[PDB]
């Protein structure tokens, strides 16, 4: 769930995941995907097209076990739904600090209204 | 749709809705109710408690069309659901704009895991 994901965003990146990551570019936060602005933006737009692939359980709601070991960040086996959505997660959150140098607050609260058509995942 | 209620919210108060209401208090945003901090979270408290009444549509995807006339918003549907949800969204949009006076930026980013239980619905 959006627990889950927001711990893990912030034990990667360091950055509260609200103000960073709550609503940048095109693709981070609700409304979908679109064409991404940056690399940071293009971490969330894979990380939409992952939960797509999910079936029987709400990435959203639906929380999860998971633990940090080794500053790694272990899915539990919870069950096979539930173990894709953690690794979807996982990814965006390291996908998110490997791209933290060029992270862009210009990008932060951007109108998604204003975001080109995604391709279809 | 959160589309929708973007735009609402925007029309109404004049401000970017991811900046000013993405994360706000206890309700505005994400990861469900808690006992509000103040007029803004309770806007957003009365919003969620709003959907939660609704039965054969969905809040976050389900697109609806309206209007802005003499400077109001004008629900455009007949469907009792969409109608309803139209009327949620604009209820939360006025809401806001209605206290942006008491509007406290402390709350923003207001960790919500830390919130009181919310009264039920
Ligand atoms: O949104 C802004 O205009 C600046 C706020 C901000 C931007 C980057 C940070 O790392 C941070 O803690 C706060
Ligand atoms: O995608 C990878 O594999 C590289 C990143 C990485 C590298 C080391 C870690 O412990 C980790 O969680 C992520
Ligand atoms: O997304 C916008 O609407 C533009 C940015 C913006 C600039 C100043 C504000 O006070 C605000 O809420 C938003
Ligand atoms: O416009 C105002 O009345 C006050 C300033 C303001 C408004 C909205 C913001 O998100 C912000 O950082 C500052």
Chains 1, 2 share one sequence.
Request: with cysteine.
């Amino acid at each position: 769930s959006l627990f889950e994901l927001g711990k893990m965003i912030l034990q990667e990146t360091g950055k509260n995941p609200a103000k960073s990551y709550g609503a940048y570019g095109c693709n981070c936060g609700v409304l979908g995907r679109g064409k991404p602005k940056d690399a940071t933006d293009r971490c969330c737009y894979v990380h939409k097209c992952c939960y797509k692939k999910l079936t029987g359980c709400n990435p959203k709601k639906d929380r999860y076990s998971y633990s940090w070991k080794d500053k790694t960040i272990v899915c539990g086996e919870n069950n096979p739904c539930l173990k894709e959505l953690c690794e979807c997660d996982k990814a965006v959150a390291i996908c998110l600090r490997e791209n933290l140098g060029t992270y862009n607050k210009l990008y932060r609260y951007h109108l998604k209204p204003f975001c080109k058509k995604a391709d279809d995942c």
